[PDB]
């Protein structure tokens, strides 16, 4: 009798508002009615789901204003919400018209409000292999994803349940990738920044980025991860780019050591195969996101990605390049410097009791328990980066900007593998400064550009802390030798270079370790004016940095 009273469109007036007497009765009291529906649940929901095509907003408000009370008083009449949910999540075939095409959007928000309630009031239970109305509600969600009618901000509370939808295999996952890609290519800007700041377009876009970060921040998936990383790679940088970095460091440390291999190897296959596209996007995976992810706290010692990269790195490294064409060349070169960056970092944050001793890493590298030193793969690495940065361009003028960055990344790999896994000063000259001049086979011509004029604004402001440094210099300069009372009483792109950091890391390790021959070589190369101005200035800034 009460359900028959409620599900009725009877018009009242305070004048011009019309305010149906189902809605107004459900506005006045709204809770003790829901205790009656608690008193007999089963006929209430079965009869409540009888008219569900006309009285759509009505019964959705009935469910919302019942689950809010069943959620808030969970401190008495316990063991209730589970049976409530596992009963109601069975008859969503009754709903077929709120979320479909030619249907109101506020009713669609109402469906997802019932969704937010059945996934807030209860736990992860109705998710596995057609447990409840999961394949009768997922299609409602998919039709609210593939529709051309929802809003750029009123999906904002509507994407947030992918944590309760990243727990699956394939089959529906393919069309999930499909609906995510189509909402991205109809709801994200094409490359970068093409919306005015302050306006409620660009701000709801950064809210969309924020809620994606909130979703994968807990829900550790490679599922959403290549989907978001493809828009993280469509340009060189983005507008909200640090937020992805903070959330990547946030997703890095959660445990789940096996899933980290999944993230690395999965976005590594999204990077790794042919996939003809532009090279910045085709390398920016391993250039930014993979390095910044596997750098911080992904896994402190991981050899499964670092077991398949044994097979999957040196095969690309030991290659030949075809220079008839650029579109076969640049892909090989970019994935080669990506592999240089990967082995750089993989030797940067690994200890020595697992990789360079006679351990299971080299037992993975070559088949059989090795008596060898562990310096076999690192010997093929060291040889080929030496070949890489000592590869001449004695007539070669094709794509020399990429080969310069390649050569410096090659030496970055070399610096990392030499600064970490041994303790003797033999290689410390022999692979770093012993550069043998047969014909053309030196270092800095081949790995430093030497091809522009560095433009300097001079000392533009703030000489504030440096005056005290100069007065302290005149303190220690006179009072140490022949100090009187006082005496006189009278009246930036060389750093951000991708080059300065590994040198000023290696020498600031090489000090605290033991005229050296490398000191003689850089002693001569700085006062020799046949040498260009460029590496003269750069090794000058080196010497200034490493005091």
């Amino acid at each position: 009798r009460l359900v028959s009273l409620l599900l009725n469109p009877a018009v009242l007036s305070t004048a011009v508002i019309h305010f149906s007497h189902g809605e107004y009765f459900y506005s006045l009291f709204s809770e003790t009615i829901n205790t009656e529906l608690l008193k007999n649940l089963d006929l209430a929901v079965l009869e409540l789901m009888q008219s569900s095509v006309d009285n759509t907003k009505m019964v959705s408000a009935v469910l919302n204003g019942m689950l809010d009370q069943s959620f808030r008083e969970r401190a008495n009449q316990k063991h209730q919400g589970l049976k409530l949910a596992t009963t109601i999540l069975q008859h969503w075939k009754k709903c077929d018209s709120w979320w479909a095409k030619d249907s109101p959007l506020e009713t669609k928000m109402a469906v997802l409000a019932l969704l937010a309630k059945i996934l807030q009031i209860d736990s992860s239970v109705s998710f596995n292999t057609s447990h409840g109305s999961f394949p009768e509600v997922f299609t409602t969600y998919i039709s609210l994803l593939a529709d051309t009618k929802l809003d750029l901000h009123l999906k904002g509370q509507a994407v947030t349940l992918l944590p309760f939808f990243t727990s699956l295999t394939g089959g529906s996952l393919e069309e999930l990738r499909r609906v995510l890609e189509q909402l991205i290519v109809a709801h994200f800007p094409m490359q970068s920044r093409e919306f005015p700041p302050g306006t409620p377009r660009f701000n709801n876009y950064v809210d969309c980025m924020k809620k994606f970060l909130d979703a994968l921040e807990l829900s550790q998936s490679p599922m959403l991860l290549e989907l978001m990383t493809e828009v993280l790679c469509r340009e060189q940088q983005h507008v909200m780019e640090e937020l992805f970095q903070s959330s990547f460091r946030r997703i890095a440390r959660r445990g789940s050591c096996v899933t980290q291999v999944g993230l690395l190897e999965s976005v590594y296959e999204m990077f790794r195969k042919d996939d003809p596209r532009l090279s910045f996007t085709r390398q920016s995976f391993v250039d930014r996101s993979l390095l910044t992810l596997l750098w911080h706290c992904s896994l402190d010692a991981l050899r499964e990605f670092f077991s398949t990269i044994v097979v999957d790195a040196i095969d690309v490294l030991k290659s030949r390049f075809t220079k008839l064409n650029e579109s076969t060349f640049d892909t090989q070169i970019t994935k080669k410097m990506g592999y240089y960056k990967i082995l750089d970092v993989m030797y940067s944050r690994l200890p020595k009791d697992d990789v360079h001793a006679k351990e299971s890493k080299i037992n993975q590298v070559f088949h059989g328990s090795c008596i060898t030193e562990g310096n076999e793969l690192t010997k093929t690495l060291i040889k080929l980066c030496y070949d890489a940065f000592t590869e001449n361009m004695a007539g070669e003028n094709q794509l020399l900007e990429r080969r310069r960055l390649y050569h410096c990344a090659a030496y970055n790999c070399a610096i990392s593998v030499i600064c970490c896994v041994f303790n003797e000063l033999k290689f410390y000259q022999g692979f770093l400064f012993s550069e043998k001049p047969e014909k053309n086979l030196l270092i800095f011509e081949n790995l430093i550009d030497l091809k522009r004029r560095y433009n300097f604004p001079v000392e533009v402001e703030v000489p504030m802390e440096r005056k005290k440094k100069y007065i302290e210099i005149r303190k220690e300069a006179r009072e140490a030798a022949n100090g009187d009372s006082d005496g006189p009483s009278y009246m930036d792109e060389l750093n951000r270079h991708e080059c300065m950091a590994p040198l000023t890391a290696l020498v600031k390790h090489m000090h605290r370790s033991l005229l050296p021959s490398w000191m003689k070589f850089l002693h001569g190369k700085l006062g020799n004016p046949i040498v260009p101005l460029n590496i003269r200035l750069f090794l000058a800034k080196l010497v200034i940095n490493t005091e």
């Binding site: 030496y386 033999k426 022999g430």
Partner: peptide, 9 residues
């Protein structure tokens, strides 16, 4: 060139 650094290991 670097085989002088190979044989010394």
């Amino acid at each position: 060139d670097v085989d002088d650094l190979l044989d010394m290991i």
